[PDB]
Write a protein that binds this ligand. Structure first.
Ligand SMILES: */C(=C\C(=O)OCC)[C@H](C[C@@H]1CCNC1=O)NC(=O)[C@H](CC=C(C)C)CC(=O)[C@@H](NC(=O)c1cc(C)on1)C(C)C
Ligand SMILES: */C(=C\C(=O)OCC)[C@H](C[C@@H]1CCNC1=O)NC(=O)[C@H](CC=C(C)C)CC(=O)[C@@H](NC(=O)c1cc(C)on1)C(C)C
Lengths: 302, 302
């Protein structure tokens, strides 16, 4: 079976806390003696399209922030703003702080999101950073501050923090340094996701997965040139395939014995002839939220 | 957005341990002073279709089992068999034992699976118990002993423990009392999943989700009688809808303002006219692994 798989969320669950100002409550990430939070937690019903966070923050003091690590309360003994996040220092170092680091991920990469509310984790699922810098998340009211992450052996690489929902229902956020992924800003102005694209690299990885899985109905005897493939990719709103992408697919190509431009050839057929009522792994859609790394991780065997 | 969402896995991750006999290693669940394990961990290359677990176990002693809670080692000071599981008593009570209980779930219900290897959790995803008593999991070698579960407030309800892969690639296992879900047994005899069925109740819940989500292209002005619907359900290999199923859908029906047999009427149209190149929530398939409870949990708002 091939399922969208999220990383075990324990190491992240222990870092989720609640942060509150006025009647505004959202989630924060508690690492060591710091708690990170979308800075919009300091906005008020008035300014939502003209928030001067600079101005709004200087009018705040440490006791202006209530931080709850569950039943317990943490004391804010210092604060600062970093890009679109607030870094709150507290008099207690989270005892469950895992080994971790901050990474700014690239479009096409995937990560696990731990959807949280009032500082309480409620669900975890896998996402991909869309070429248009948004993510197809599942978030309800009270979800900002929820984080995205990957776990390699013991390091929790934090990638993302949730900040907002766009008009199409997709989500935008920042890395843990507070810089937004994409041309978005944390203010209620009316902004919109740019047009998105299908992630070519991932679909191909997926096809390799399908074959490693034992399916190969879509394969054919043809081959294509990178450039000829990109002419079709453009017609079907797929990202242009590059030599770097072909190289990344080397391991998989080897393991299955199917050359990359061959697998491409198959993909160009799929895109032209449709799936004609057939399925791959279990889908009727060309799945693009599985990276080459995700496929090796999950099909590491016969 | 509407995503297959797994429960936060932390409370379960802390109970995963490794258990070994001979050259056979698989995962076990460590609650208090007990560790549960598929009993097949005691088989040998010889008997795989004629294993007499009774006989195989009496020939075993406590030191016959090495249990590793990560770096640490636990000492087996007593053992017993319960149906298809072994209950290993150890001289240490797991300090991370969460509030929990054992539940035997019914077909159509969903749960989260924490895929584990050598006692180390590697991924979590949501599954449903298929009407045919198998699950469409994603398991590689070394995955038996991985558990399925649900979390309500603080209680981790353990449902499932993985034991085997069937010929079609689907999985079979037992509840935590060691009784298999389905007519399967823990021996290499050649068995096969019975024919499966689509879970009608869940699809309907999903449609309600789609509407709560803002989509409603599939709705129509028609209505149907339970019996008339079941005549179509049978042609399309769907489970017969019952009055109990209609009642369970009450809350959702109310919230959306669409009567159950009306929503049915829409479903019978979908099944007859196909989706004609359209999508629901994001699928081109009528999704049946979301229960009414899953939909309320995830669309609890506007
Ligand atoms: C999370 C807010 C929170 O957790 O605290 C309150 C309890 C939230 C994310 C949302 C909630 C529903 N689903 C989500 O993903 N973020 C926001 O509500 C931001 C807050 C912004 C400031 C500066 C206070 C606001 C929005 O997301 C709003 N939309 C837009 O700003 C927008 C409009 C256009 C056009 O492009 N972007 C709405 C409330 C959705
Ligand atoms: C997990 C075994 C384990 O963790 O320990 C060894 C390191 C495993 C589940 C598999 C692995 C691949 N994907 C999975 O889900 N369970 C088994 O291998 C059982 C063990 C059985 C006994 C009594 C020792 C065996 C099987 O699943 C085998 N198939 C069948 O038994 C079968 C054939 C037919 C027909 O119907 N059922 C194969 C190894 C798949």
């Amino acid at each position: 079976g091939f399922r969208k798989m999220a990383f075990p969320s324990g190491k992240v669950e222990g870092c989720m806390v609640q942060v509150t100002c006025g009647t505004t409550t959202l989630n924060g990430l508690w690492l060591d003696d710091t708690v990170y939070c979308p800075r919009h937690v300091i906005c008020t019903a008035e300014d939502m399209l003209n928030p001067n966070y600079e101005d709004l923050l200087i009018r705040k003091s440490n006791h202006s922030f209530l931080v709850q690590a569950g039943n317990v309360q943490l004391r804010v003994i210092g604060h600062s703003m970093q890009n679109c996040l607030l870094r709150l220092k507290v008099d207690t170092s989270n005892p469950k702080t895992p080994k971790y680091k901050f990474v700014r991920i690239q479009p096409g990469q995937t990560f696990s999101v731990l959807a949280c509310y009032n500082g309480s984790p409620s669900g975890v699922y896998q996402c991909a950073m869309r070429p248009n810098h948004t993510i197809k998340g599942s978030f309800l009211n009270g979800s900002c501050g929820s984080v995205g992450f990957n776990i390699d052996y013991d390091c929790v690489s934090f990638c993302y923090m949730h900040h907002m929902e766009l008009p199409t229902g997709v989500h935008a956020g920042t890395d843990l340094e507070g810089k937004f992924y994409g041309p978005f800003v944390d203010r209620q102005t009316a902004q919109a996701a740019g047009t998105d694209t299908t992630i070519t690299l991932n679909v191909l990885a997926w096809l390799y997965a399908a074959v490693i899985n034992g399916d190969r109905w879509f394969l054919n005897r043809f081959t294509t040139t990178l450039n000829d493939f990109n002419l079709v990719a453009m017609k079907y709103n797929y990202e242009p395939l590059t030599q770097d992408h072909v190289d990344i697919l080397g391991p998989l190509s080897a393991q299955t014995g199917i050359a990359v431009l061959d697998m491409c050839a198959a993909l160009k057929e799929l895109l032209q002839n449709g799936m004609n009522g057939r399925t791959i792994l279990g889908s009727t859609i060309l799945e693009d939220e599985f990276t080459p790394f995700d496929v090796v991780r999950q099909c590491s065997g016969v």
